[PDB]
Design a protein around this ligand. Structure first.
Ligand SMILES: CC(=O)N[C@@H]1[C@@H](O)[C@H](O[C@@H]2O[C@H](C(=O)O)[C@@H](O[C@H]3O[C@H](CO)[C@@H](O)[C@H](O)[C@H]3NC(C)=O)[C@H](O)[C@H]2O)[C@@H](CO)O[C@@H]1O
Ligand SMILES: *[C@@H]1O[C@H](CO)[C@@H](O[C@@H]2O[C@H](CO)[C@@H](O[C@@H]3O[C@H](CO)[C@@H](O)[C@H](O)[C@@H]3O)[C@H](O)[C@H]2NC(C)=O)[C@H](O)[C@H]1NC(C)=O
Ligand code: UDP
Ligand code: UDP
Ligand code: NAG
Lengths: 568, 563
C-alpha cells in the first residue's frame, strides 16, 4: 500500500517510551552472506532484544536483497507463514536490487501490504516519504580492495564514466562530449577498464578523476555509487527520478552533483561552474559517507535502524551535524548553543557573585562599589570558609551562601536564586572599578550575550624552546583570555562549568586551588567558538594549567583578537 | 499514468519554460467583479512585490491565479461559486501545468477532506493542512495556516527576549481550546482530562461550540466551563514550556504559529500532518513531534527531554518563526524559493541553509552553493575567514595600501570574499585598514567601518529620522569606509526589488542606507564601528522601512579599538 505512513499503518502501542530512547528489534529464527552479515550486525548492536512482546520491529530471516532468484510467490508465502505477520505492521525489509527482467518496478515485488521496506533503488513514485528508507547498494569491491586514503587535490582527469552495459544513447552522448572536449572526459569500455589502446584497473582508475559519472542502466541504483564514493571522486548521478540513499538525513547536495538526464550534453558546462574549494569539500564528504555508511553492511544496518529509531522517537533523533560531518570538521565544528541574535533589554540585570575566603574589608568596598551601578539585581556573596563565619547584621537584595566544601569552583554553580542571565563574577582584590565601567560592561554584554566580557586582559603564547604553551601578561598587544574577575558571562556558562566539563578539569582546579579563570575561558571559547571581549611559582602554575587544559581538549580553543570595546 | 494524483516535477512540470535562467512568476489580472478575501490580497501583493513577478505571460514559467482559492468551504463567507468554470475558461490555464495554487481551508462539515473543488490537474497546490498520505513528496508545498489579520510585511519580533536557564517556566504542557462534543477530530482534545494535572500540566477545554451544544453536553462540561475562565490564553502560552497543538476539525491550526511566537516548543498531536515547509525545514530542532495515540504518557516523555535539548528547541522555534513564518510575505517568498530550488538541482540550497541562521530567504544559491562562499557558516564548518580582501573604489586619491590587499578595483562613471568599499574623498591609513580587516575576521557577517550614523523615531511627525553629529549611539555604518562580504553585493543587486534601487539612483544617494538596512535585516545584529541634501535621507528611510515592514536597524553603543 503506497498510501501507508508511520501514523496510519504503523503500531506505536507495541513500543513506547523508555529511559534509553532506542527501538528494540527482534529477529526471527529460520542464506546470502550479505543477509547473514546484516543480521549479525543487528544482533551485536544496542537494538537487539528478546521477549517478542517487548520489541517493536521485526526483521525476517528470508533472503530478499537479490531479486534475480527471489521466487516472489515463495517470499510472500514465507511472510504469511512468519506467524507474527500482523499484516506486516512493524516488520522491516531489506533490499538492494528492486528490478525484474520483464520490467524494473524500482521496488520490491512481494505483496507487503504494510511491511516497511529499506530498498536500494527508490523512485520518487514508489518511495514512501516518511515510512521507507533508501539504503545504499553494497559493492563487494569496497572491502575487497583497500584504496589508499589519497588527499583531495588536482587530478589528471576531470570527468570519468566507468560503467558496463550502458544504453547506446548515453554512450553516444558521452563520446560526443569526449570528442568535443578531450583530455578531460574519459569514457571507459569493458575489474579491468579498457580504453582504446590503453588499459586501466577499475578500482584505481577512479582515483585519477575529480568527477565520476553514475548512470541509470538498470534498477535505478548501481553498485558503482559506493566505489565512486570510496575512491573519492564526486558522483554525478544522471539517473533522474532516483532518490539517493539515506537522503532523509544525509545532505547529498554537499557530496554529489545531480544533473537531469535531458541535460547530459550540458554536464561539462555544469561541472565547470563549480569552484575547486567545493570540489575538495564534496570529495571529503564522499569519502566520509563511504567510510561511515557505505563501507560495510554493518554501517548500512546501523544507519537504517538508527533512522527508524529517530522516526519513532523524534525528540531523541541525532543531530544533522552528527549525520553529515567528517570527524575532522566535527572536531573543528562549534555548534554554539546560544545562537539566537536577540538583545535582552535593560529590564533585567546581572546577579553579581563575589567569592571570598578572607579579606572582609575589601569585600565591603566591593559591595559598596558594585551596589552603586544601575541595573544590578542581586548581589550574591558566597562564603567558602568552614571556620570563619560571615559578619551578621553588619553587611539591592543580598544573599550570603555557605559552602559545604571550600572549593574554588563554588563561584560557578547554577543557583536557582539567579533570576537573570548576565552574571558578574567579581573578586575582592579588584577595587579600581567605577560604576560607569560596570554599566558599560553590561551594555556590551547585551550585544554579545554568548561570550565573556571581562576587564582584565591575559594572553598566551607558544614557546619554541620548550615546545609548550606559556602564560603571558606583562605586555599587551593581543588578548586571548579575560579573567573571571570582573567578567560578564551567561549563566549557561556556569551550568556548563558545573556539569558539562570534559576530563577532570573541575577536580583538578579544586585540588590545585588555582586556575579557574583559564578553565572558564577554555570551556567558553570551545562551546561558543568565539573569542572574548576585553573592556578597558605563580607564572609557572598558570603555564602548567594552560598546558594541562590544552592537553585535555586536544587543541587550543582560545583565539587571539586585537580589539577591545570602549565607550563611544 | 504519472500525470494524475501522483504528479512530480519531472512529469507534471515544464522545465523547458524554466530552462532559461529566469525563474519568474506571473499573476493573473483581476476580473474586477468577484469578491476577494484580504488574505489572498496579501498573497497576491507578496508575489507582485517580489523580484519573481513579471507582467509578460510568455517569460514566466510559474503561474498563480487571481481567484480566491484560500477559502474552499461552502459554509464560509469567502467561498467563490462556479470556480470550476472560471478556472477552465482561462486562456493560459493549459490544464494547470506550471500553476501554483494557494489554499488554506478545504472540506465540508461531515468530513473535512481536501475538497479544493475545481480540477487542479497537473498544478501544484500550496495547501495549509496537508495529510502526509495525500502529499506529493517533491511537488506540493505545505504552508502554515495564517489568519486574516496575519501581517503582510514586517513582524512581531517574537517573544523570547531573555534566554533563561533552566529553560523552564511555571507550567509545562498547556492547552486552552474548544472541545467538540460531536464531529470528527475531537478525540484527542476530549481525552485531555485524563492527563490534566495541577500546575504542571494544565489542560483547559470549552464545550460552547455553535448553538446546539446544550443538547449534546455531558456532566463533564459543567465543571470545565467554570475552570476554563480562570487563566488567560495569551498569558498561559507565556508561562508555559511546551505548547500542545492538537488536531481540531482540520490537521492544521492557528495555535502552531501562536506556539512559535510564544517561544514555547510545540508538541503536535495531529497524526500525519505535513508540517509547514517540511521538505526544507528540520522539525526535530524547533518542535517535539509526538503521536496522539500515546497521549497518556506524553507528559512523561516531555519530562524526559533534557534541559539543553529544551534550550535548543526554544531557540530554534524563535529563529524559525522570525525567518519563515513572521509575515505572509515571508511565507510566499519561502514557497517561491522552494519552487525555485527544484528547477536546477545543482544551484539550490542545502539542508544547512534552511535550518540555520540567517535562513534560506537571504541565502541565494545562484551566487554559490558552497557554504564557504557565505559569511555565515564558518563556525559550522572547520574554516576560517579569508585572509585577503579586494578593495573596490567608486570614483565620480591616496589609495595607499598594500597589506592584506590582493587587488584594487577603481570604478569610473572580485576573487576574495571580503570587499573594501572606499570613497575617494575619504583618507584612511593602511594600519587602520589592517585593523578594520582584523576586526572583520571575527565578525564576517556584519559591516565593519569607521563612519557611523543612527536613527530615531520622531513622534511629532510619526516619521523615522537620521542624525549624523555627536550621536551617543549608532545603528548604521557607511559603506564609504566599510568592510563586508561580496555576497552582500550580490544580495543587494539580485534580492531587493527594482523600486528601491531606482529611487536610490534617482535621488543620487541612499545606497549605503539601504545596504545597512539589508545587512541588519539578514544578520539581525547591529553593525560595528571601529576607530536640501539632508531632507531626502528621511524619505529614503521611510520608504525602505515601509518595504521591509519594520526597522531592522538595531542600536549599539560599543566601539572596537586596537589594544
Ligand atoms: C446537529 C448538527 O449536526 N449540527 C451541525 C452544525 O453544528 C454545523 O454548523 C457549523 O457550521 C459552522 C459555520 O460557521 O458554518 C462551522 O464553522 C466553520 O465554518 C466557519 C465559516 O463559516 C469557519 O470560519 C470555522 O473555522 C469553521 N469551524 C470549525 C473549524 O469548527 C462549524 O464547524 C459547524 O459546527 C452545520 C453545518 O453548518 O451542520 C450541522 O447542522
Ligand atoms: C572542544 O573540546 C573537544 C573535547 O572536549 C575537542 O574535541 C577533540 O578534538 C581533538 C582535536 O582537536 C581530537 O583529537 C584527535 O583525536 C583523534 C583520536 O580520537 C586522533 O586520531 C587525532 O589525531 C586527534 O588527536 C579529540 O579526539 C577530540 N575529542 C572529542 C571527545 O571529540 C574539540 O576539538 C574542542 N574544540 C575546540 C574548538 O577546541
Ligand atoms: O582556600 C581558598 C583560597 C582562596 N579562595 C578564593 O580565592 C580568591 C582570591 O584569589 P587570590 O588571592 O589569588 O587573588 P589575587 O591575589 O591573585 O588577586 C577569593 O575569591 C577566594 O574566595 C577560595 O575560594 N578558597
Ligand atoms: O481562550 C482562548 C481560546 C482560543 N483562542 C484562539 O482560538 C484559536 C484556536 O481555538 P479553537 O479551539 O477555535 O481552534 P480551532 O480548532 O477552531 O482551529 C487560536 O487562534 C487561539 O488564539 C484564544 O485566543 N483564546
Ligand atoms: C505569565 O507571565 C506574565 C509575564 O508577561 C505575567 O504577567 C503573568 O502573571 C504570568 N502568569 C501568572 C499566572 O502569573
Amino acid at each position: 500500500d503506497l498510501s501507508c505512513r508511520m501514523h496510519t499503518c504503523f503500531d506505536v502501542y507495541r513500543c513506547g517510551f523508555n529511559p534509553k530512547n532506542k527501538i528494540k528489534v527482534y529477529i526471527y529464527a529460520l542464506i546470502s552472506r550479505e543477509y547473514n552479515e546484516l543480521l549479525m550486525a543487528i544482533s551485536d548492536s544496542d537494538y537487539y532484544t528478546d521477549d517478542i512482546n517487548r520489541a517493536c520491529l521485526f526483521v525476517p530471516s528470508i533472503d530478499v536483497l537479490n531479486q534475480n532468484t527471489l521466487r516472489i510467490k515463495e517470499t510472500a508465502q514465507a511472510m504469511a507463514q512468519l506467524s507474527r505477520w500482523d499484516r506486516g505492521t512493524n516488520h522491516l525489509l531489506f533490499n538492494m536490487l528492486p528490478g525484474g527482467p520483464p520490467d524494473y518496478n524500482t521496488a520490491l515485488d512481494v505483496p507487503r501490504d504494510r511491511a516497511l521496506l529499506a530498498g536500494g533503488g527508490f523512485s520518487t513514485w514508489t518511495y514512501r516519504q516518511g515510512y521507507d528508507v533508501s539504503i545504499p547498494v553494497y559493492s563487494p569491491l569496497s572491502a575487497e580492495v583497500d584504496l589508499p586514503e589519497k588527499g583531495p587535490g588536482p587530478r589528471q582527469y576531470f570527468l570519468l564514466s566507468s560503467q558496463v552495459g550502458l544504453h547506446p544513447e548515453y554512450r553516444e552522448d558521452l563520446e560526443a562530449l569526449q570528442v568535443k572536449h578531450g583530455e578531460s572526459v574519459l569514457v571507459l569500455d569493458k575489474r579491468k577498464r579498457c580504453h582504446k589502446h590503453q588499459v586501466f584497473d577499475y578500482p584505481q582508475v577512479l582515483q585519477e578523476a575529480t568527477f565520476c559519472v553514475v548512470l541509470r542502466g538498470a534498477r535505478l541504483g548501481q553498485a558503482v555509487l559506493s566505489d565512486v564514493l570510496q575512491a573519492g571522486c564526486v558522483p554525478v548521478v544522471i539517473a533522474d527520478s532516483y532518490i539517493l540513499p539515506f537522503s532523509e538525513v544525509l545532505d547529498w547536495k554537499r557530496a554529489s552533483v545531480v544533473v537531469p538526464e535531458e541535460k547530459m550534453s550540458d554536464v561539462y558546462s555544469i561541472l565547470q561552474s563549480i569552484p575547486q574549494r567545493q570540489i575538495e569539500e564534496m570529495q571529503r564528504q564522499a569519502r566520509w559517507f563511504w567510510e561511515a555508511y557505505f563501507q560495510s553492511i554493518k554501517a548500512i544496518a546501523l544507519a537504517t535502524l538508527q533512522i527508524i529509531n529517530d522516526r519513532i522517537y523524534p525528540y531523541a533523533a541525532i543531530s544533522y551535524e552528527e549525520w553529515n560531518d567528517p570527524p575532522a570538521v566535527k572536531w573543528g565544528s562549534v555548534s554554539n548553543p546560544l545562537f539566537l541574535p536577540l538583545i535582552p533589554p535593560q529590564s533585567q540585570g546581572f546577579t553579581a557573585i563575589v567569592l571570598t575566603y578572607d579579606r572582609v574589608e575589601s569585600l565591603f568596598r566591593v559591595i559598596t562599589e558594585v551596589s552603586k551601578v544601575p541595573s544590578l539585581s542581586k548581589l550574591l556573596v558566597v562564603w567558602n570558609n568552614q571556620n570563619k563565619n560571615p559578619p551578621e547584621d553588619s553587611l539591592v537584595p543580598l544573599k550570603v551562601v555557605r559552602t559545604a566544601e571550600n572549593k574554588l569552583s563554588n563561584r560557578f554553580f547554577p543557583y536557582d536564586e539567579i533570576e537573570t542571565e548576565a552574571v558578574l563574577a567579581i573578586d575582592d582584590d579588584i577595587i579600581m572599578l567605577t560604576s560607569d565601567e560596570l554599566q558599560f560592561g553590561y551594555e556590551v554584554w547585551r550585544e554579545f550575550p554568548d561570550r565573556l566580557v571581562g576587564y582584565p586582559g591575559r594572553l598566551h603564547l607558544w614557546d619554541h624552546e620548550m615546545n609548550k604553551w606559556k602564560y603571558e601578561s606583562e605586555w599587551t598587544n593581543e588578548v586571548s583570555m579575560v579573567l573571571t574577575g570582573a567578567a560578564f558571562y551567561h549563566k549557561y556558562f556556569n551550568y556548563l562549568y558545573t556539569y558539562k566539563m570534559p576530563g577532570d578539569i573541575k577536580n583538578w582546579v579544586d585540588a590545585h586551588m588555582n586556575c579557574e579563570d583559564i578553565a572558564m575561558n577554555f570551556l567558553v571559547a570551545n562551546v561558543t567558538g568565539k573569542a572574548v571581549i576585553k573592556v578597558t611559582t605563580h607564572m609557572v602554575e598558570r603555564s602548567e594549567c594552560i598546558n594541562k587544559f590544552a592537553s585535555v581538549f586536544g587543541t587550543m580553543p582560545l583565539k587571539v583578537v586585537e580589539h577591545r570595546a570602549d565607550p563611544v | 499514468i504519472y500525470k494524475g494524483k501522483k504528479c512530480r516535477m519531472e512529469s507534471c512540470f515544464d522545465f523547458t519554460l524554466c530552462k532559461k535562467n529566469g525563474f519568474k512568476v506571473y499573476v493573473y489580472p483581476q476580473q474586477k467583479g468577484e469578491k476577494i478575501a484580504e488574505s489572498y490580497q496579501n498573497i497576491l501583493a507578496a508575489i507582485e512585490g517580489s523580484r519573481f513577478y513579471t507582467s509578460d505571460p510568455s517569460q514566466a514559467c510559474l503561474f498563480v491565479l487571481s481567484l480566491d482559492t484560500l477559502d474552499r468551504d461552502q459554509l464560509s463567507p469567502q467561498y467563490v461559486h462556479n470556480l470550476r468554470s472560471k478556472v477552465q475558461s482561462l486562456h493560459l490555464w493549459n490544464n494547470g501545468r506550471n500553476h501554483l495554487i494557494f489554499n488554506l481551508y478545504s472540506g465540508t462539515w461531515p468530513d473535512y477532506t481536501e475538497d479544493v473543488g475545481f480540477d487542479i490537474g497537473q498544478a501544484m497546490l500550496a495547501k495549509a493542512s496537508i495529510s502526509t498520505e495525500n502529499f506529493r513528496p517533491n511537488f506540493d508545498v505545505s504552508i502554515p495556516l495564517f489568519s486574516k489579520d496575519h501581517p503582510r510585511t514586517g513582524g512581531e519580533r517574537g517573544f523570547l527576549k531573555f534566554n533563561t536557564i533552566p529553560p523552564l517556566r511555571k507550567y509545562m504542557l498547556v492547552f486552552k481550546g474548544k472541545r467538540y462534543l460531536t464531529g470528527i477530530g475531537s478525540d484527542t482534545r476530549n481525552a485531555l482530562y485524563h492527563v490534566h494535572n495541577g500546575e504542571d500540566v494544565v489542560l483547559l477545554t470549552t464545550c460552547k461550540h455553535g448553538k446546539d451544544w446544550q443538547k449534546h453536553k455531558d456532566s463533564r462540561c459543567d465543571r470545565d466551563n467554570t475552570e476554563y475562565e480562570k487563566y488567560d490564553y495569551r498569558e498561559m502560552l507565556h508561562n508555559a514550556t511546551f505548547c500542545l497543538v492538537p488536531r481540531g476539525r482540520r490537521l492544521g491550526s492557528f495555535r502552531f504559529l501562536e506556539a512559535l511566537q510564544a517561544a514555547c516548543v510545540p508538541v503536535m498531536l495531529s497524526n500525519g500532518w505535513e508540517l509547514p515547509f517540511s521538505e526544507v525545514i528540520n522539525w526535530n530542532q524547533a518542535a517535539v513531534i509526538g503521536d496522539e495515540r500515546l497521549l497518556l504518557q506524553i507528559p512523561s516523555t516531555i519530562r524526559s527531554i533534557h534541559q539543553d535539548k529544551i534550550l535548543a528547541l526554544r531557540q530554534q522555534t524563535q529563529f524559525l518563526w522570525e525567518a519563515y513564518f513572521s509575515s505572509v510575505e515571508k511565507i510566499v517568498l519561502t514557497t517561491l524559493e522552494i519552487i525555485q530550488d527544484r528547477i536546477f538541482k545543482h544551484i539550490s540550497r542545502n539542508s544547512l541553509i534552511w535550518n540555520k541562521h540567517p535562513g534560506g530567504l537571504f541565502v541565494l544559491p545562484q551566487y554559490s552553493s558552497y557554504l564557504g562562499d557565505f559569511p555565515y557558516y564558518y563556525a559550522n564548518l572547520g574554516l576560517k575567514p579569508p585572509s585577503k580582501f579586494t578593495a573596490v573604489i567608486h570614483a565620480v586619491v591616496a589609495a595607499a595600501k598594500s597589506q592584506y590587499c590582493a587587488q584594487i578595483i577603481v570604478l569610473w562613471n572580485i576573487i576574495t570574499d571580503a570587499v573594501l568599499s572606499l570613497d575617494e574623498d575619504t583618507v584612511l591609513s593602511t594600519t587602520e585598514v589592517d585593523f578594520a580587516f582584523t576586526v572583520w575576521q571575527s565578525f564576517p557577517e556584519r559591516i565593519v567601518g569607521y563612519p557611523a550614523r543612527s536613527h530615531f523615531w520622531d513622534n511629532s511627525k510619526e516619521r523615522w529620522g537620521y542624525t549624523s553629529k555627536w550621536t551617543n549611539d549608532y545603528s548604521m555604518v557607511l559603506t564609504g569606509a566599510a568592510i563586508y562580504h561580496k555576497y552582500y553585493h550580490y544580495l543587494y543587486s539580485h534580492y531587493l526589488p527594482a523600486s528601491l534601487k531606482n529611487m536610490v539612483d534617482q535621488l543620487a544617494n541612499c545606497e549605503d542606507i539601504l545596504m545597512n538596512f539589508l545587512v541588519s535585516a539578514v544578520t539581525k545584529l547591529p553593525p560595528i564601528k571601529v576607530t536640501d541634501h539632508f531632507a531626502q535621507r528621511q524619505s529614503c528611510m521611510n520608504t525602505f522601512a515601509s518595504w521591509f515592514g519594520y526597522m531592522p536597524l538595531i542600536h549599539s553603543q560599543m566601539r572596537l579599538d586596537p589594544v
